[PDB]
Design a protein around this motif. Structure first.
Motif: not given
Length: 51
Positions: A45-46, A48-49
């Motif tokens: 989630s950080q 790579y998104g």
């Protein structure tokens, strides 16, 4: 969670990945399921998104 442990120990992305031997390491290359996971997921989630 191995990747969660590293996260709690102040680690982000580089300082856990450790060039491919780290806890969130398989969560990087072969990571199609890594977002639908949990232990990988917050990291991705950080880093790579998170898909």
């Amino acid at each position: 969670g191995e990747c969660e442990q590293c996260f709690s120990d102040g680690g982000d992305c580089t300082t856990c990945f450790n060039n491919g031997t780290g806890p969130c390491a398989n969560c990087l290359a072969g990571y199609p399921a890594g977002c639908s996971n949990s232990d990988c997921t917050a990291f991705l989630s950080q880093c790579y998104g998170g898909c």
